[model samples]
Target chain A: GELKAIAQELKAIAKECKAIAYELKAI
Target chain B: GELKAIAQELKAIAKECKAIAYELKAIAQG
Candidate 1:
């Protein structure tokens, strides 16, 4: 469960990366 | 358009990040 939590955190990071991808795509 | 191509390239990188994210999740499951 602890490692799963870390995975969740990493997913959040991927979400951020996705947002940046959209921003870059926009520009 | 040239910059847009770079954007496309960056998007690919993000895709890899997403793949890595899945790997981490799977490892957690393991």
Candidate 2:
């Protein structure tokens, strides 16, 4: 359910990317 | 999605980079 586009969907994709960065940092 | 893991491109990453190359006719840094 996470197939958002990057440019058109910056808000969503940025959030997803941010979550990943946080998760990686958390590890 | 490849490594360069500790640096940029994990956000607005490679598919976009490819387009940037194609769209701008940018010299391939290969």
Candidate 3:
């Protein structure tokens, strides 16, 4: 399933995305 | 008066927030 979301929970996915983006930016 | 949730690719609403009994479209958009 393609989850189109704007999650803000224990701040999990967003946090993960942020970290992922950070790493990508670094690359 | 629907609510909110982590609406996924269409698993189902934990509370039927309006359309699908899900989504929020003002009147239909909430």
Candidate 4:
């Protein structure tokens, strides 16, 4: 359960990272 | 550039986390 939650948080972080990458691409 | 690389690394980490989660789920099943 904890690992799953951590995995979800990690996924969220990864999503944010992707967004940042997208912004960079736009720039 | 650098941020993109970091982003790729983060995605890799997320993939690893998901793999770990799957393993945990398998263990939980046992």
How do all models score by TM-score?
0.50, 0.32, 0.30, 0.51
- DockQ scores for all the models shown? 0.04, 0.04, 0.04, 0.06
Query: Which clashing pairs does model 4 show?
Result: none
Residue A23 of model 3, lDDT score:
49
**Model 1: per-residue lDDT, tens digit, B1-30?**
445544555566679677666656666676
Q: How well is candidate 2 docked (DockQ)?
A: 0.04
| Ranking according to DockQ, highest score first | 4, 2, 1, 3
For candidate 3, write residues A1-27 as lDDT tens digits.
222233334235445544544444333
Q: Candidate 3 or 4, higher DockQ? A: 4
Worst 10 residues of 2 chain B by lDDT: B1-10
Cα lDDT of model 4 by residue, A1-27, tens digit:
565556566667766655554454333
| Residue-wise C-alpha lDDT for candidate 2, range B1-30, written one tens digit per residue | 323321333445544444444534433322
Span of ten consecutive residues with least summed lDDT in model 3 chain B: B9-18
Ten-residue stretch with the least lDDT total in model 1 chain B: B1-10
| Tens-digit lDDT track of model 1 for A1-27 | 565555555566657776654554333
* DockQ value for model 1: 0.04
Residues A1-27 of candidate 2: C-alpha lDDT, one tens digit per residue:
233233345544545655554444333
Model 1 pairs in collision = none
True lDDT of residue A10, candidate 3: 22
